[PDB]
RNA sequence: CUCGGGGGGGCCGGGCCACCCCUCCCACGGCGCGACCGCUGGGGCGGACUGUCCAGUGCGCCCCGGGCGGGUCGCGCCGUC
């Protein structure tokens, strides 16, 4: 009788985010940075 | 002027360049300023993340500032057998 595909009507939303971005080339790089003074700084303490 | 023959100056108008002053546009080069494009420390808000010391890193919007680079445009001055 009707095989008409109505199509749900679309409604706008609030910009959501639902996973992470990539990390920059700063925020990876000052990561390693802050990993390297760490382990120093452990080593310090230790001894 | 020289022995009819021979040698010269010419005839009067216009514009132009030299001389002395200003003056329009264009081209090229330089200097300075300005506008916009435009390369690239600080502050505020929001948010995401990282570090085996509380510290640190991007991103979105806004507000400034410096170093000083080029381009487009517009001026002002200088130079050009």
Do not use: G, H, I, T
Request: no cysteine; glycine share 0%.
């Amino acid at each position: 009788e009707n095989p008409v595909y109505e199509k749900k009507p679309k409604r706008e939303v609030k910009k959501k985010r639902w996973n992470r971005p990539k990390m920059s080339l700063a925020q990876k790089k000052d990561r390693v940075a802050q990993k390297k003074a760490s382990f120093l700084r452990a080593q310090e303490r230790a001894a």
